[PDB]
């Protein structure tokens, strides 16, 4: 019936009661008065050509789960809005909250700076709730994948359970950016958190395109940019050898990026 | 069903379908053909 935005609420409320956090609510008039903006992902389309040259699939397996775990841009560390930051008042997200006075100056070291300007702590002092959530989703995902790939033939006895559990975890993970969906028909939108996480996904994608464009040895040119994945066209690059260059390029981007992203 | 046998004037349509043969999915239907049709009842 509800479809979206709701399973992630139940799993997050399970985790944050397990870590004894206390959730908040907006009212709908307060949803419509969030100063709600959308710094959209500025992905850009390809040019009109045939692209006879073979192409590579970059295949970020998830933007928003993998960057919630990898960068800790979570719900539970929203202390930011460097533009007009003060002790008394912070109109960040859905409501208007104060901040304690020294703990941000005390937290000068532990900030990961967002590209839109909300200062977010590392996991080294926090071990964040949403980070724990999507840590659990990637851990369960790789357990399911490895057990599915290890059982052998398994002619529709346990393989059905493993693949439908796989699709259940994937159907959680694609909509966990939802409930940061930032619409009028939403509960706890937190629109500038969505701005932060998709803008750092965009700049992660630009870090992918400038590890692509500055690697002259693995010569390529970006053509199709999009959110979940990226496509370059490898100019005349003998695709049986692109079977090597895609895996080696994937190792070169995973080593560039932090640990969880594959 | 009356136990005295009457003259049962009727026409036999017991088994008539095809041993040799896919828009209408015939072979999946023809699984029912092979075993039941083979029985001569």
């Amino acid at each position: 019936y509800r479809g979206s935005q709701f399973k992630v609420e139940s799993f997050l409320i399970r985790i944050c009661k397990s870590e004894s956090f206390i959730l908040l609510s907006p009212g709908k008039k307060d949803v419509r008065k969030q100063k709600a903006l959308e710094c959209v992902p500025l992905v850009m389309e390809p040019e009109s050509a045939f692209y006879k040259s073979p192409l590579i699939v970059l295949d970020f397996q998830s933007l928003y789960p993998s960057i919630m775990i990898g960068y800790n841009y979570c719900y539970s560390t929203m202390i930011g809005r460097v533009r007009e930051i003060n002790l008394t008042e912070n109109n960040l997200g859905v409501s208007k909250f104060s901040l304690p006075r020294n703990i941000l100056a005390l937290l000068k070291n532990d900030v990961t700076i967002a590209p839109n300007g909300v200062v977010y702590a590392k996991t080294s002092v926090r071990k964040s709730t949403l980070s724990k959530m999507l840590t659990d989703i990637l851990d369960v995902r790789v357990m399911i994948k490895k057990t599915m790939n290890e059982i052998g033939d398994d002619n529709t006895t346990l393989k059905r359970l493993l693949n439908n559990k796989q699709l259940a975890l994937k159907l959680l993970a694609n909509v966990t950016y939802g409930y940061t969906s930032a619409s009028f028909s939403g509960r706890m939108p937190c629109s500038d958190l969505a701005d932060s996480i998709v803008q750092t996904g965009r700049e992660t994608l630009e870090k992918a395109i400038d590890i692509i464009e500055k690697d002259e040895t693995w010569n390529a040119k970006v053509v199709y940019g999009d959110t979940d994945s990226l496509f370059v066209y490898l100019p005349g690059k003998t695709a049986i050898e692109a079977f090597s260059i895609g895996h080696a390029m994937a190792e070169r981007v995973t080593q560039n990026n932090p640990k969880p992203i594959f | 069903q009356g136990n005295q046998p009457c003259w049962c004037v009727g026409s036999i349509y017991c088994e008539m379908k095809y041993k040799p043969n896919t828009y209408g999915a015939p072979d999946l239907t023809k699984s029912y053909t092979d075993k039941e049709g083979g029985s001569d009842e």
Binding site: Y1, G3 | A25, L28, T29
Partner: protein
């Protein structure tokens, strides 16, 4: 002129077919099977689409 919804319910009393109390339906109205073309996947069409029969 009779309420069968209460007897279909596991519960005994309350004091469009959108939702039956204590129960839950499944099919096409809230739940597409494969495609964004929900009307396309009527049960005569999806007989061959997925079951191949």
């Amino acid at each position: 002129q009779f309420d069968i919804v209460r007897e279909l319910a596991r519960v005994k009393c309350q004091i469009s077919g959108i939702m039956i109390t204590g129960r839950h339906m499944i099919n096409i109205w809230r739940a597409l099977r494969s495609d964004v073309n929900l009307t396309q996947y009527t049960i005569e069409s999806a007989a061959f689409n997925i079951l191949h029969k």
